[PDB]
Amino acid sequence: GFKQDIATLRGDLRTYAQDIFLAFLNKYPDEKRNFKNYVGKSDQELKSMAKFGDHTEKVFNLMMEVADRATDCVPLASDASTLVQMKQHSGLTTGNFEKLFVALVEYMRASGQSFDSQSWDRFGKNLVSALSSAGMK
Ligand code: HEM
Ligand SMILES: COc1ccc(O)c(OC)c1
Q: Count CB neighbours of 52 within 10 A.
A: 22
Q: Which ligand is nearest to the CA of 38?
A: 1
- Please enumerate, by residue number, every residue annotated as part of a binding site: 36-37, 51, 55, 58, 88-89, 97
Do the beta carbons of residue 20 and residue 105 sit within 8 Å? no
Q: Which ligand is nearest to the CA of 55?
A: 1
What are the DSSP calls for 56-113, one per residue?
Answer: HHHHHHHHHHHHHH-BTTB--HHHHHHHHH-GGGTT--HHHHHHHHHHHHHHHHHSSS
**Which method resolved this structure?**
X-ray
The number of angstroms, rounded, from the C-alpha of 97 to the middle of its chain's C-alpha atoms is 8
89-126 burial, b at 16+ Cβ within 10 Å, e below that, comes to: beebebebbebbbbbbbbbbeeeeeebbbebbbbbbeb
- Please enumerate, by residue number, every residue annotated as part of a binding site for heme b: 36-37, 51, 55, 58, 88-89, 97
Domains along the sequence of the chain with CATH = 1-137 (1.10.490.10)
Tell me if 34 CB under 6 Å of ligand 1. yes
Do the beta carbons of residue 60 and residue 84 sit within 8 Å? no
DSSP annotation of 40 reads T
